[PDB]
From a paper:
Here, we report that c-di-[name] can assemble into a tetramer that mediates the effective dimerization of a transcription factor, [name], which controls the progression of multicellular differentiation in sporulating actinomycete bacteria. [name] sits at the top of the regulatory cascade controlling development, serving to repress expression of sporulation genes during vegetative growth (den Hengst et al., 2010).
Three S. venezuelae [name] C-domain-(c-di-[name]) structures and one S. coelicolor [name] C-domain-(c-di-[name]) structure were determined to resolutions of 1.95 Å, 2.33 Å, 1.75 Å, and 2.25 Å, respectively (see Extended Experimental Procedures and Tables S1 and S2). Further, [name] from S. coelicolor and S. venezuelae contain an identical DBD and differ by only two residues in the DBD-[name] linker and five residues in the [name], suggesting that [name] function is broadly conserved between the two species. The [name] [name] interacts with c-di-[name] using two contiguous surface motifs, herein called motif 1 and motif 2, which are located between the two β-α-α repeats. The combined motifs from two [name] subunits provide ideal shape and electrostatic complementarity for encasing the unusual cage-like c-di-[name] tetramer. Further, mutagenesis of either [name] motif 1 or motif 2 abolishes c-di-[name] binding in DRaCALA assays, confirming that, unlike I-site c-di-[name] binding, both motifs 1 and 2 in [name] are required to construct the complete binding site for the tetrameric c-di-[name] complex. Overall, these data demonstrate unequivocally that c-di-[name] binds the [name] with a stoichiometry of four c-di-[name] molecules per [name] dimer, concordant with our structures.
Author numbering:
A (entry chain A): 83 to 157
B (entry chain R): 83 to 154
Amino acid sequence: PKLVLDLERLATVPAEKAGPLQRYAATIQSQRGDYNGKVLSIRQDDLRTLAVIYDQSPSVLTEQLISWGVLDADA
Amino acid sequence: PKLVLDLERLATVPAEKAGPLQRYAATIQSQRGDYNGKVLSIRQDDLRTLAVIYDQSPSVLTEQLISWGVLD
Ligand SMILES: Nc1nc2c(ncn2[C@@H]2O[C@@H]3COP(=O)(O)O[C@H]4[C@@H](O)[C@H](n5cnc6c(=O)[nH]c(N)nc65)O[C@@H]4COP(=O)(O)O[C@H]3[C@H]2O)c(=O)[nH]1
Ligand SMILES: Nc1nc2c(ncn2[C@@H]2O[C@@H]3COP(=O)(O)O[C@H]4[C@@H](O)[C@H](n5cnc6c(=O)[nH]c(N)nc65)O[C@@H]4COP(=O)(O)O[C@H]3[C@H]2O)c(=O)[nH]1
Ligand SMILES: Nc1nc2c(ncn2[C@@H]2O[C@@H]3COP(=O)(O)O[C@H]4[C@@H](O)[C@H](n5cnc6c(=O)[nH]c(N)nc65)O[C@@H]4COP(=O)(O)O[C@H]3[C@H]2O)c(=O)[nH]1
Ligand SMILES: Nc1nc2c(ncn2[C@@H]2O[C@@H]3COP(=O)(O)O[C@H]4[C@@H](O)[C@H](n5cnc6c(=O)[nH]c(N)nc65)O[C@@H]4COP(=O)(O)O[C@H]3[C@H]2O)c(=O)[nH]1
């Protein structure tokens, strides 16, 4: 399963919920110099680190991102 | 030193030296379905994967990769 984020839906999720995801995605973009600004695919191991940053299980985290329509239901 | 590979350069490299790396390249491109240019950039840690498959030190591998013109 692929992990693809919607950069445009993400930007409008309030910081209180999405702040740490937004900052994480920004550090990847800066490192990449990847500023397409529509979509961002991350490594499957980036999910474990986000889950730690969010303090949830990778599983709980995924379902939340999907619930926001940021992460394609494919994952 | 970032691993940006010139696939067009490496093709012209004789098979008994370029082979493993050509075949490694091709596996990565198949993993990503990345078939849109003559350049392949790979992970810095892949250097070790490669030094293992070639059974040479990273140092060695990296320096003949530059003579070959495959790397910058
Ligand atoms: N800028 C960007 N676009 C994304 C991202 N995720 C998905 N896409 C879009 O979705 C397709 C597949 O992305 P992919 O799984 O990364 O799979 C990609 C990726 O593996 C690779 N690829 C394409 N361009 C580049 C590149 O500039 N650098 C690297 N390192 N790989 C690339 O080729 C595969 C197919 O690329 P395409 O089908 O032509 O086009 C893309 C691209 O239009 C992302 O994080 N950033
Ligand atoms: N060792 C190695 N393995 C490789 C390489 N390229 C691809 N793979 C493997 O193939 C999977 C799919 O690559 P992808 O479609 O480009 O899909 C990639 C891709 O769109 C993007 N991605 C991950 N890392 C990078 C990166 O450093 N740069 C860019 N531009 N995109 C990345 O995140 C997606 C998921 O990444 P993964 O879960 O890791 O899943 C990756 C990874 O297991 C490589 O150069 N070296
Ligand atoms: N996961 C993913 N990431 C993407 C995709 N398209 C672009 N990117 C990201 O966006 C950066 C800039 O892409 P670019 O300058 O348009 O243009 C790229 C591209 O023209 C070319 N390039 C270098 N390496 C590769 C490669 O392995 N595959 C491909 N298809 N192009 C590459 O050099 C420039 C910089 O390459 P990068 O260092 O890889 O840096 C890429 C990469 O991090 C994509 O479809 N999927
Ligand atoms: N399509 C595709 N290309 C891949 C993948 N892995 C590596 N690459 C390519 O190989 C490059 C160097 O990978 P790196 O040493 O891991 O160096 C990477 C890595 O340290 C980091 N980075 C980029 N994207 C991601 C990511 O999604 N997750 C993580 N944890 N680190 C990333 O920033 C670096 C520079 O990224 P780039 O400019 O994009 O340059 C990337 C990219 O062109 C992959 O799974 N799929």
